[PDB]
Design a protein around this nucleic acid. Sequence first.
DNA 1: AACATTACAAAA
DNA 2: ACATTACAAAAT
Lengths: 92, 83, 276, 1168
Amino acid sequence: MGMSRERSLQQYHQTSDYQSAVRKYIEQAVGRAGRTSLKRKQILLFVDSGLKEILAEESRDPSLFSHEYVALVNKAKSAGKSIVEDRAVRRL
Amino acid sequence: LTHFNLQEFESAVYESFDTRGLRLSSSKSYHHTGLKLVEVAHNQGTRDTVNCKASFLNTSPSGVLADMVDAGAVILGISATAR
Amino acid sequence: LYYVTDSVDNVVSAKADLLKLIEKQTVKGEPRFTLEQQEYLKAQIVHLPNQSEQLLQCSDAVLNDVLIGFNLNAERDVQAEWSAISGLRRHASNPEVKISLNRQAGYFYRNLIDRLQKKQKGADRVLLSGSLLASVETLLPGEKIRNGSAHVAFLTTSKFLKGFHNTRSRYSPLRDLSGAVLIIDEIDKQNQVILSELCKQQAQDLIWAIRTLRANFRDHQLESSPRYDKIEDLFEPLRERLEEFGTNWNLAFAFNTEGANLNERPVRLFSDRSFT
Amino acid sequence: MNVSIEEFTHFDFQLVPEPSPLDLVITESLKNHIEVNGVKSGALLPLPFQTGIGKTYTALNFLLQQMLEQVRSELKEEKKSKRLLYYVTDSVDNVVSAKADLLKLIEKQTVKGEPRFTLEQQEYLKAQIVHLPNQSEQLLQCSDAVLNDVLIGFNLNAERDVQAEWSAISGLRRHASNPEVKISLNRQAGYFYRNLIDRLQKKQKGADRVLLSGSLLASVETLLPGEKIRNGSAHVAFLTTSKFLKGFHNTRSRYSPLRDLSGAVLIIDEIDKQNQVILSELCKQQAQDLIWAIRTLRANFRDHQLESSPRYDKIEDLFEPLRERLEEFGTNWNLAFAFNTEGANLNERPVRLFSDRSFTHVSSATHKLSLKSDFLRRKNLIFSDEKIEKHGLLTRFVNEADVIYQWFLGTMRKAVFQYWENVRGLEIRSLEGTFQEAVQSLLTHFNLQEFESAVYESFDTRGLRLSSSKSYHHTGLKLVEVAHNQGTRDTVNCKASFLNTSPSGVLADMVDAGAVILGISATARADTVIHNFDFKYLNERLGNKLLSLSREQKQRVNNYYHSRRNYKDNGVVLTVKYLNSRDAFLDALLEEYKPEARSSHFILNHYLGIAESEQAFVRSWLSKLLASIKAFISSPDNRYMLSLLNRTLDTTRQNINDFIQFCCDKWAKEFNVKTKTFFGVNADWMRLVGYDEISKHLNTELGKVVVFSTYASMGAGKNPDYAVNLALEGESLISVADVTYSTQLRSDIDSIYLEKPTQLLLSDDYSHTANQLCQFHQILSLQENGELSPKSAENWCRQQLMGMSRERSLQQYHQTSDYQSAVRKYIEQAVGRAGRTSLKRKQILLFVDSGLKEILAEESRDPSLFSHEYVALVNKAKSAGKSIVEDRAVRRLFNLAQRNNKDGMLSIKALVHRLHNQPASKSDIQEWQDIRTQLLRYPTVAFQPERFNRLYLQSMTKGYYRYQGNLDGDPNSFEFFDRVPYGDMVSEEDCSLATLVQNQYVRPWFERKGFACSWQKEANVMTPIMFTNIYKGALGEQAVEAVLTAFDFTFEEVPNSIYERFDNRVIFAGIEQPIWLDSKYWKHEGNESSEGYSSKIALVEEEFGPSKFIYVNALGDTSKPIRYLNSCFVETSPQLAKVIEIPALIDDSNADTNRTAVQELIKWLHHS
DNA sequence: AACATTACAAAA
DNA sequence: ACATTACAAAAT
């Protein structure tokens, strides 16, 4: 019918694919900023609070995550756990 | 194409062999069937005939990658968010 | 061997770093490769940019050599375009000139390579050796791949999907991927790059196409030479299907619409081809 | 705000300036055309107005008068469309200058001393004139504001593809450096204009059509000058010939003037040159693959149908015969298979075939090429039979395919016209408004969209169209190349290039479409078909539509020219000299140039850079040129010399220049006169410092000037005059007119040297195919006019197809009188373009290459309109007495007799072959019967025929002639008239018509049928082929039919299965078995075999069983016995014979019927 | 009443 | 063995 981009985005935001894409963008952003070996005493990360509920849903193996991404995920998860629908069951 | 007098399909055929010359059959998946969008509208310059202009996607990017792997190519994809 | 990534800058930088690695690699403290071995290794690596940048990086001497060696120096339509582009080149002002220079470079490269391929396909095929071979390999990096001088190619994803020219035709890597090795940098973005390439295909008029196929497959036949052995049997079911379909839908008539609301807006149909 | 038409209300349209005799010459001639013919008929008026007499002023005054007539009609008719006016010439510079002079004429015209037009009237008049340049120059003259307004108003400002291109071009515009940038800028302007106008037209065609008004309308009219013509704001257009032929764009489509020429007026400057210009476009057409085209037409016309709506009424019947022909052709040639070649020599070289489409066919193959369908291989193979099989030839297949393709294009034109008629009927809008929609609808109903372009160009060159008239000028030629397809080595294609008409045919089409054409040129009626239109063909085709000046009008023009160029009464003398080559003279200056050298040949070979082979040629060119220059330097009063050569003296021959320069200096020192030289004065030089330097030097320095140029460099609008400074010139100047020191004081060239023009055959550098078509067109035009015999033309065509050199083509051309006419045309133009002013020297020196003396001495036209210099040249040449030359008229008569005989010879054979092909057609029977009827009714005609022109030849005698040739052999070996004093004679007596008509039975039949009983003593008489193969047979058949009908016999029409095998079928007394008849006019040996007669009889009985066969001789001795023969033509008993032979029906001594023979025939019929 | 943008590659 | 050149327009 020819709807608008805002309505397509609203349709997309109801999927867990959207959250995975958000976390992918955050991971790339924090990874493209640690390219050297000389580090300051303190590294400050400031995050839009709307990302917190998303980043608390990271569940993959952190064996290959960067240090900044692990710090972000731990800080988000520090607020406890939130009730979410399992991706596998809904996909089933 | 010259034996069949079908030279006007030449370009089309070439493009097909670009996107489907890379090709376990009755498996069903959007990634190797694609989609089709058809517009039925009046022909240019004449107001009493119509045409059916169709745009196709015969495969998805994942289908293209699977085709390259199945064609014998060894692919090393390097990315931190590769999976 | 292919090194593929999305950006041109990453391709150029990766080739530069490979050359640096060849130059400066050491084992146990001694240099790994001698100067001759380094030169031989560097000779096997080729870079395939878009056609405009391919033309603009060739000197006027190389292009004059190519034109003289293929007897295109007297065509007028070719010499006028090349003279105009050389004049633009010697007057490279602010990018206002550069955009036009790039566009004309692309068009001239298309025309020149088309004529060169046509000349090489015929019986009066030019023999390539020495300075002419060097000039052609400078103008056509794919000729190095075709001859066997080089086997490593640095290119972008879109260039890989479209292919590159040599003296004979346009070579498509996708049709010759048996045994090749691909190193794809930033692989997850190649999904979007490939999708953008796939969504650019030309639309087809289905009524015209089916009518043409039905009209031409009704009578026309292949020759029964050994080159066409068992090829005619591949098309018989298609001929039967076409004849039955044309009988069913009355393809002798042309198509039209009538009624309300069918004129203001064209009809749009979407199909996933299975159940949507 | 723009002026309106309501301003001319108080203007008086009867007050005109005093008209010059040239204006009367135009208007008086054009009025009698409206009287004799109608107001809707076109005309062609060639006006021999020489340059400098005021021809541009006259043409522009006529154009302004037409503009005023249009304004007056609009005021009185207070909505008819405006009458279009076109000013067409070859050069862009001439177009721009003519428009500038028209605007100046509007601004500065006065009547009785008061200004003719007010400021607002002047603005309104200037608003009606438009100029149409090429698309690149059209774009580059629009400001960025206009283009931004156009893009914004059509919502193209956000498209990326358009905006990137426009940004690139705008960036290029500001950085306009040396032409290295300008060439690319022009190319990009052309491409961007293509894309932008295409998008604008697409957007205007759809429902979302932008409304144009105010600033957007002004911007669009600035970008698209044709939109002004389409709206009706303007109706006068200045454009070039090529632009006129191609057309121009408006907001809807590309407008083609050729399709809308009804009522338009064309002013064509330098008309005779346009013959060449038009040919160029005609030679640029795209080649067509005939195999692909015919296969596509056959596949798509087999099933696809048009809709039966009222818009398509009676259009399908236009295409039904083409469908039947296509299906029959496809079965005949097995178009289900693809084509290929095999054999020796068929691979190294492609096959080339040339056809004039009537009687000139040439093949590049040494042996006849055959075409065979191999069903086992499923292929169509082209063979070379190393051993006549009429069926199965490549030439037959190619000719039939070409015929079918052209038939399809013509039927598409007819269908477009019918669609326009139906649409006009329904929606009650010109032929141009429905042309594209009709083409699209027809091609999409038939699924034949790939022919779209092929249709459009055709309607350009054949939509401009007294039918059975035969002439090369409206049939054209065809060049076919059979060669392997690209990329595949087992199929071939047949690429064909066509010329469907000649430039003369195009001009005749424009005149017949309702256009009034004024062609202005001093050499407008030259006697060349190579460098001018064919005016014999134009006269034949147009009749009184081709206007001309009477003797009194010509004398008025001559008096006006003499009054403005009075030489004799003002003491101006023209001294003409003819220069021969002098070897010792050149040797002297050669030795003085390099005194250290041993011989002059060493100097030419080493110092001048002349190769030893060409030295002699140079020694003829140089020794003449210098001989003029010296004679110019020793002349005291002369200042300005122009040397017209064939080759440019640029830096490529720099060394030669030095030698000439040296000589000049020496001669200057020998005569104490300063001399300046201008070498290499060509078109590129004029684009640089632009001939104003020579004028300034003549105006400011007291020395002689010698300019070295060529014929090609001196164009129509070059104007080589300088501003006179009376201090530098003495008393040598003379005024030859009566004008009171009009504006500036200017003089012209005073001394001239003329070389013999050389490369007088046209050529095309666009491509190899275009040049081939140009050469073939020239050969065929020379054959059509009669300058070549058919044998010479066929040999020349064969050599051209083999690929000869230009020198051999020139040698072929030099043997014609067309060559001499072209030479004299070039000389006349050269001397006419050098007398453009009225201030003349005491003496005017003309130096002429002596090789021209023999040519110019053959001038024979009326010198009433020649210039003074040309008359002086002709008189000087003729001063050597008269030379014996062959008359052009009689030689053309011989050549045309041979041409007509050959054309009839081949046409009769083709028609008979088509007749002996069962099933036959109906147009073929009609053609055969019409030919016989025309010959019977008009054996000789007084006027030149129009519908059957190739059945007759023009003889020197009246009603009879002599010939000597083999009527069954080679048509190229026939001789006619006094060349064969003792030969076969064609007249009324050799056909024994007078003795035949004396009989009491044939004569009433001839009167009631209208057949001539005698031959009028006329100049047009039938060719020998028609006298022997057609006329005598018709006489015998008619005599036999009348004699038998007098005895109560009935005759019925033979059916097509046995046509031309037997003339008639006989019914008498109701005998239920069929009876077949054969008649021979007089006694002749039965060259057809008895086995052939038996074959015919068996063929007849195969379809009709037993019957009767009669072989009767119309005229002969009636005492001979009546014969009975069997099926084997052996004499047998009357009780079992099947063939009855009658030796004579009417006796040849007293014209008495053999009634006994008729009675015996009746008894024979009673015995069966 | 949702959501809220930049960037690029091959050109024909 | 002939004969013996330059110039134009519309561009696709």
